Assembly symmetry: D3
Homo-oligomer: 92 residues x 6
């Protein structure tokens, strides 16, 4: 029982606080399925212009899977900070 | 007409690409209304524990409006990078 | 009981995992006292060169309390990501 | 002699300033040994659940070495900004 | 015609605004050629100390191509935010 | 003499390395004058639409001085990481 009460910074939460943290996570699921859709598209448009070197140089220069990775990380860290704003740990 | 074709890095987009960029922005609207809801909550719980100095020190130490600001920025920059992954500008 | 088991992404943790998360937080306390020491120093060197406009322009241009704020945020988000690496939530 | 006086933004430092910058770096050594310990743990728990596909999918989905990498970078950039707050270069 | 007027957040821009966004991108080209020069240098100093294990351990510990990658990303996201400050989309 | 040789992580630099670090800082001066120009523009377009509440709500919603601040920080941290890639400190 109660493993998070062993971690420093635990605060008792309301249901209202817990509902807001699950609403953050629910919306992050919708971003997850969106990034998966963008990843499928990038993988489709890379394979559908095989042997066309000008478009493969165009995709290599645009670096879109890297930017999709930067986008996923910032969505996730943003969710973590909104959750921190709601949970409010008494710890640095 | 066509002001973005004056900006360096313009690429012609498909409707499929434009639909994906508007789907990013639509989901960011849902995060916008969520952060507004969290902001209303923090402003409610600050005012509802006026003159209780221990809880005002507890809110001051937790810094939740600052973390909500860090959360909003990272959601926005994450949306900007996913949109960059789809639009793919031919520019640094 | 068990409020974090109501939040999506909960995973059962070992004591070894809990000890590592508290070791992250303990070290963040040492960074907290360090940033407090740097903040006291900046507030000391601002007041100890009152009316010297060249040094007040030198402090204003260097922007050190802003950089100390950027430093505190990155220490905190770094602690949050190491804790995420240990806790490993089954959620986006 | 004096190679950093060839770099734009050099400022003469006190011993008090130099002691604070070395205290930042000393504490970053303690974070370095912590991240090494977390890295050893993740490499241990990956190998100790070889051929269990459900736990390898659980580790792959949690992405913990990636989050440990995000955590290391933010600890380092946070140390760089606290050091900038102390050193205060006269340069953008 | 006018594909960016299909994307949510479009605002009509002045030539003064468009000149400022192209001035951001022009300066980012100068940073691009700089990072390419730094990348060539790192690749030169890695190959020019092959079989010297102490210097290869020194380069591996310093992690400079990783820091050059962190530097390129932050230059790019900084350009994106200055452009956002000028373009000012009416969207989250 | 030699205050940076008292700081942990000092490495002897070449002139080629010092020239590259000053070339980073020179280009950051050009970004500094650019952000100053963007700041003057935002302050001009705020004052030139005083008492027009729809445009003041449009500027308040777009948050451009905040995005200019996010842009300045990321340009600066990007310069710091490129300089770290060149200087290569033997320290965490």
């Amino acid at each position: 029982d109660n493993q998070h009460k062993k971690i420093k910074g635990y605060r008792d939460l309301s249901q209202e606080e817990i509902d807001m943290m699950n609403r953050v996570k629910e919306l992050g699921s919708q971003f997850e399925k969106l990034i998966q859709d963008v990843s499928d598209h990038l993988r489709g448009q890379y394979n559908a212009s095989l042997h066309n070197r000008d478009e493969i140089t165009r995709i290599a220069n645009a670096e879109p899977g890297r930017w999709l990775a930067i986008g996923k990380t910032d969505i996730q860290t943003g969710m973590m900070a909104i959750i921190r704003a709601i949970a409010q740990p008494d710890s640095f």
